[PDB]
Amino acid sequence: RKGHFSRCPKQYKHYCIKGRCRFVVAEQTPSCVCDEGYIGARCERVDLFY
């Protein structure tokens, strides 16, 4: 019954232009997800032709 982390705001989305990122403080876990239809390490290109 617990839930409280930190959602990476757009002001800190420099490591992912078109992608999201969840940073867990209590559990040092800086995870960074990106739009499935995205390309590039920093998420700068896009390929969602689908």
Side-chain angles (χ1 to χ4, degrees):
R1 246 156 131 178
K2 73 172 141 266
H4 231 164
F5 303 87
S6 313
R7 246 209 243 151
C8 282
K10 234 113 128 125
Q11 190 127 110
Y12 268 109
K13 269 186 220 264
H14 264 33
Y15 49 64
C16 272
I17 292 182
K18 27 181 55 270
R20 304 273 237 171
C21 188
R22 297 292 171 118
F23 205 124
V24 180
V25 191
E27 221 145 60
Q28 238 165 17
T29 295
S31 174
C32 52
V33 196
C34 315
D35 235 14
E36 272 140 351
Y38 92 118
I39 309 295
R42 260 146 263 245
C43 317
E44 194 174 76
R45 260 157 184 225
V46 50
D47 231 280
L48 214 156
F49 219 110
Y50 267 68

